[PDB]
């Protein structure tokens, strides 16, 4: 319940799309918290999207409904949407589209299609298509609140520090073009017989990233939430990640301790395990104590159905 | 204990480096199983490396010792090594090295350094440096067994399907060079006054990936292990991943069910939870039944110290 | 602006006829320029006055100008500016300068700078009449047939850009992270050459004059050249027979030579008979001074 | 292989002297070629026989060959091959062909193809003596000063490649996933031009001959050209005064003209006096037939 108030406060200011994003180690339940917050926010009439760059398609399993690239309404909710990212499917569509253009020339076309196939099969495309859709929804509106289940770290978010580098490189390209512009004219006269485009795209990207950065670094719009478990791994990790997000100047309004073993436990096993969870809980209330901390228990049931989802919802709110 | 025999069998054939790689959902304990298998294999005199593309640096937390990029001996073991990947640190080193070269020219150098800064800050570099080191150790020897804690999926391993695409594109480039080679000569005569390199690098990469693919698709060298939990998420996920690895023709010798609640449990909580874990266990013995299945319990202690590590070791062996 | 241009074999006196026509047109108040792509700088010898690249008034004439082309000088002149502008990168400036020197020393630059100034004055006004002493042939003027080739190649580049434009964006989103310029320059050149071609193919604006000698070489040559100029659709209003031995001659030598010149004159009045033929004699004096120039002027007019 | 090359103003008879020297050298058993970059195809008119690009025997001489340069033809010839080879991509072939036509029509191709065949025969053997009727000047021959510029630019490219080589690999590992060729061609050209320059600057191999007329134009011109050739360190073994009016002349016309020719002859024996001067008269007949050719031959030898 401890989180509700903070959320409510976040919603009002800076009218427009509000962003919420959960982060934490693998497991640890951030996809879970995302789905739950989506359901809760969708309970009040609100138009909320949950975007997921998960290739494992976790939201498919949690919701039990398949989701395409385009936003899909979920579970009879008129107002709740989820965006699943498949770079491969997209890629097939782009291939159809390209093939359509290349009819006049097969050789040019088979070549370009090959280059694309290689591009898609390259190691960067997951994270970079993730990037593309992220920017698409940072620039977007028509969604009252956006929940990123893309799992952020300072290291995944390192692209936020680019615009300055882009500035330096751009001024370099401008100096260069000024030096060159004279020479190429004399070559164009003595022996007759791209930059503006590179600068266009560079500047465009610079502005997109700068906007996104300004939105993310601003509360009243974006809320970063850490989710953790009472175990040293997730605690230390999320601490470091918190420090990197700090380096990007990002607000973290809340930490969520998850899968807590309930206070009623009897057999020695869960006795020991909960002793440990209490030690780690003191560790958490030490390191993360300056932040709002929420607690969710370890459910008797596995957390799957919308019922368990609404349950967790009320547990956080 | 059920896994030991299979491992032993894997070690003997195809003398050279033997590869073992664990995969599964976030959490689920694959870094854990990796560390444990590393310890176990290091117990018999064997030279074993555990490489981790984890930016969260899990092995630092589990072992409690810091690891650099170059292989580092761990915990008094003369024979046990772990490789942690930091792309950023590397990047700083590359920057020092570049700056050293650019002294004659600052403008060229500041530009190139800018391009690199942008490269490193780009969304692909984590996964692609992961790729680079992966290939480095596929091509490598002097390590008796290599354990990849890089978390593989069919989708991360999609780069294995490239060599054919590279073949098509290469033959395209050859046809092209044959068509061009005539023309450029007449231009070189009528109006006086890269390919071999592109083909060199393309072919080189093609052979590296082909070698790696052939090694990974071959038992007696590489063993892919899935680790799962008695929960629908990890089960379905690891099933799909198993199918993609199947598409790349990869052997999966073993599935490891982890964090099992021990058979002695009393209070109703763990009663319900273990009932569920049994249902999911039947689900597992159904889907994954054609594979060797190993069981590890949920430890009273959090799994951190080398003692818990050796414990889990004997539990699997 | 009216354009007059003389052509013919080496020697044969087209630089001479150019100078003379310049003087004659400058006699009536008219502003006339004689541009010369001669690296030989023949106009320097004929006029006796030195001429720079920029149009220079000649021989006390307020209205008569001539332009001499030196490519080397222009190159070197630009180099200084280049130095001033690219200080950093310092290495780049030296490379670019090297490319420039390599360019200037290349075999194309004479003819192509000739081309550049030609187009400069085809596009120009403020000169009532322009006289080109650049020596035209159909082969020198072959650049006039370009604009159609430029069209084909341009449409090729457009089809190409339309084919590429889709691919590049998709590549960009899959892997984040010149044509318009090439087409700009190509189209600009196409329009300059089309304009020039249209002016040159049009009388009331441009007059092409052939100059010849009563010898088979120049006759046959200028005939072929006439046929190429024909292929570009160019008017040739006049043929000028030059260095004719005057009708008063006595010793057997010039008797024989003038007999030959008469045979070749019938050859000329045969081949070139369909156009105006003018006759200039072989002057007792070498043709140098402005006096001989005005003399030849009145001889043609 | 020995090289002989004539130079001088338009007219002035260097094509003539070339043909004559060719005949004379072909009289003694010798294998001699006369190559001509004349688009005017003067040798076609002088010899009366047509000549293709490949060396053609002339006038029943087993040993006398001449090479006429037509660039257009060569281009067109290659186009067919290009078509046969690039079928797919079909679009590419049309673009490349367009670039080819655009190249051939460009103002540089005459002089630069002249250059190409020049280097072809400088590198060549199997011809005992080669006579270049391409009309040399220091300005035409300015390409000889390149190899040093090529050196500077090459070392620039090497420093550059060393600076880049480190960066590119690191970029490659950070983001997976021409010079040697440029240096190959640059160095090759540098060696060809250096060889040619060394041969041309060396007597016992190459003889540069200037031809002039007793008129201030050709005299001053060929003097300056002589000074440029001097700047490239070239031997000029002989000056040939041509079209001299014979000493038997009577009527006042040729009296005056030959007076002038004598003044200019003293000018020549002044400026060019330090080198061998040869004299050829103005022939009663136009110089065309092989008979007049052999005549001039004996006149020079
Ligand atoms: N409060 C909870 N009670 C019980 N199980 C939970 C709870 N929160 C999360 N889980 C379980 O933890 C597992 C990992 O959570 P998930 O959000 O899918 O991982 P990730 O955060 O890495 O995407 C899921 O199988 C989920 O069912
Ligand atoms: N047998 C086990 N008993 C108790 N805890 C375990 C066991 N195996 C794994 N864990 C815990 O599960 C968490 C996730 O495991 P880890 O391997 O770090 O995740 P990943 O596989 O995603 O790298 C770790 O904190 C680890 O301590
Ligand atoms: N009508 C003429 N009478 C006498 N000499 C002439 C006459 N026309 C030209 N010449 C001479 O012929 C030579 C070459 O003429 P020029 O016009 O310089 O050649 P080009 O036309 O090739 O430039 C000059 O020395 C000039 O003095
Ligand atoms: N010695 C000579 N006697 C008579 N006519 C000559 C003599 N030398 C050259 N000519 C004539 O002068 C004209 C031009 O000479 P040519 O050699 O063709 O010029 P270029 O040397 O510029 O090619 C030709 O028509 C030729 O007949
Ligand atoms: Mg998730
Ligand atoms: Mg891990
Ligand atoms: Mg002239
Ligand atoms: Mg000639
Ligand atoms: Zn219990
Ligand atoms: Zn007489």
């Amino acid at each position: 319940n401890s989180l509700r108030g903070i959320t409510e406060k976040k919603l009002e200011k800076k009218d427009g799309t509000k962003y919420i994003m959960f982060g934490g180690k693998g497991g640890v339940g951030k996809t879970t918290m995302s789905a739950a917050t989506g359901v809760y926010l969708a309970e009040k009439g609100l138009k909320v999207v949950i975007v997921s760059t998960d290739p494992a398609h976790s939201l498919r399993d949690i919701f039990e409904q398949e989701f395409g690239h385009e936003p899909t309404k979920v579970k009879g909710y008129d107002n709740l949407y989820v965006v699943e990212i498949d770079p491969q499917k997209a890629m097939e569509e782009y291939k159809e589209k390209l093939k359509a253009q290349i009819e006049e020339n097969p050789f040019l076309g088979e070549m370009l299609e090959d280059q694309l196939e290689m591009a898609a099969l390259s190691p960067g495309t997951d994270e970079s298509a993730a990037f593309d859709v992220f920017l698409k929804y940072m620039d977007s509106n028509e969604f009252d609140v956006v929940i990123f289940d893309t799992a952020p770290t300072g290291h995944t978010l390192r692209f936020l520090g680019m615009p300055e580098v882009m500035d330096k490189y751009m001024t370099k390209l401008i100096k260069l073009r000024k030096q060159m512009s004279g020479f190429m004219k004399m070559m164009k006269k003595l022996l007759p017989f791209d930059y503006d485009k590179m600068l266009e795209e560079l500047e465009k990207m610079k502005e997109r990233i700068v906007r996104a950065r300004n939105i993310l670094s601003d509360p009243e719009r974006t809320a970063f939430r850490l989710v953790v478990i009472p175990e040293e791994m997730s605690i230390l990790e999320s601490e470091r990640a918190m420090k990197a997000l700090q380096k990007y100047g990002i607000p973290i309004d809340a930490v969520i301790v998850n899968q807590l073993i309930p206070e009623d436990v009897q057999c020695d096993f869960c006795r020991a395990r909960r002793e440990l969870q209490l030690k780690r809980l003191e560790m958490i209330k030490e390191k993360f104590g300056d932040k709002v901390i929420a607690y969710v228990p370890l459910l008797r049931t596995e957390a799957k159905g919308i019922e368990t989802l609404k349950q967790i919802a009320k547990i956080l709110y």
Side-chain angles (χ1 to χ4, degrees), chain A residues 52-55 57 60 67-70 83-94 125-126 129 133:
Chain A
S52 178
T53 53
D54 186 23
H57 290 38
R60 274 192 182 163
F67 306 115
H69 171 272
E70 224 68 11
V83 172
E84 200 74 83
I85 288 187
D86 199 322
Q88 286 192 5
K89 302 181 165 215
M91 175 60 192
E92 321 286 46
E93 309 190 26
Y94 296 115
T125 60
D126 309 308
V133 165

Side-chain angles (χ1 to χ4, degrees), chain A residues 158-171:
Chain A
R158 74 191 182 276
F159 69 82
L160 292 170
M162 304 203 57
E164 294 80 4
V165 185
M166 278 179 172
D167 281 326
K168 301 195 296 180
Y169 183 72
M170 275 188 236
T171 65

Side-chain angles (χ1 to χ4, degrees), chain A residues 12-273:
Chain A
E12 316 139 2
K13 301 278 195 145
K14 297 289 165 52
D15 50 348
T17 293
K18 306 287 134 54
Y19 302 88
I20 308 178
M21 48 186 177
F22 297 94
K25 197 206 167 303
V28 177
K30 61 195 157 306
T31 298
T32 303
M33 301 298 99
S34 296
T37 290
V39 173
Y40 164 65
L41 290 185
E43 281 294 346
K44 324 175 170 185
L46 226 53
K47 204 179 178 187
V48 177
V49 68
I50 309 172
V51 305
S52 178
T53 53
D54 186 23
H57 290 38
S58 300
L59 282 311
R60 274 192 182 163
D61 300 327
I62 280 193
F63 282 132
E64 287 137 14
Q65 166 193 9
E66 186 197 284
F67 306 115
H69 171 272
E70 224 68 11
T72 302
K73 293 185 185 181
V74 52
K75 293 303 158 177
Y77 291 75
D78 299 306
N79 54 41
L80 190 53
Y81 299 67
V82 168
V83 172
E84 200 74 83
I85 288 187
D86 199 322
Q88 286 192 5
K89 302 181 165 215
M91 175 60 192
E92 321 286 46
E93 309 190 26
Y94 296 115
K95 187 198 307 179
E96 265 143 35
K97 219 171 219 190
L98 182 62
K99 283 175 178 170
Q101 289 149 354
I102 65 186
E103 64 188 348
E104 313 187 85
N105 207 350
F107 202 95
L108 183 42
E110 290 156 353
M111 236 188 73
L112 300 191
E113 178 194 340
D114 283 339
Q115 301 201 32
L116 287 181
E117 266 172 36
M118 288 176 75
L121 299 199
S122 297
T125 60
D126 309 308
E127 214 177 319
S128 87
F131 175 83
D132 194 79
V133 165
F134 170 82
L135 267 192
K136 177 176 178 178
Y137 287 87
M138 286 302 306
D139 195 10
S140 172
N141 289 122
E142 300 175 340
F143 272 140
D144 295 322
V145 173
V146 176
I147 309 178
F148 293 107
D149 189 32
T150 81
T153 61
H155 204 37
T156 58
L157 293 180
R158 74 191 182 276
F159 69 82
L160 292 170
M162 304 203 57
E164 294 80 4
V165 185
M166 278 179 172
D167 281 326
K168 301 195 296 180
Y169 183 72
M170 275 188 236
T171 65
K172 245 62 173 61
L173 277 183
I174 297 183
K175 283 182 169 290
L176 189 60
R177 184 186 61 194
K178 265 67 175 304
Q179 301 167 2
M180 291 293 300
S181 201
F183 166 79
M184 203 55 191
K185 198 149 304 177
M186 188 60 185
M187 277 300 305
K188 187 187 62 178
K189 82 164 50 183
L190 168 63
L191 202 137
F193 48 85
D194 53 329
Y195 284 89
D196 318 79
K197 273 179 170 172
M198 290 188 306
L199 262 28
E200 269 182 23
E201 290 166 322
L202 279 190
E203 229 293 330
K204 190 169 301 184
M205 267 301 294
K206 205 219 72 172
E207 285 174 355
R208 304 190 77 188
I209 300 189
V210 158
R211 163 184 165 85
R213 175 171 71 192
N214 291 331
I215 299 184
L216 299 185
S217 60
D218 176 41
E220 308 180 331
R221 295 219 69 169
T222 78
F224 201 108
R225 270 132 209 206
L226 266 294
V227 307
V228 284
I229 56 176
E231 295 185 11
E232 280 197 17
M233 301 289 310
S234 182
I235 295 174
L236 303 179
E237 286 196 12
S238 296
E239 179 183 11
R240 313 189 205 110
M242 170 194 179
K243 291 199 174 186
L245 297 170
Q246 195 102 3
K247 186 177 68 61
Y248 297 98
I250 294 282
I252 313 190
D253 65 4
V255 191
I256 302 177
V257 185
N258 193 28
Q259 300 176 35
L260 256 176
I261 299 184
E263 196 191 305
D264 55 283
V265 284
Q266 293 302 318
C267 75
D268 280 354
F269 187 66
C270 12
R271 289 217 174 281
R273 286 205 59 84

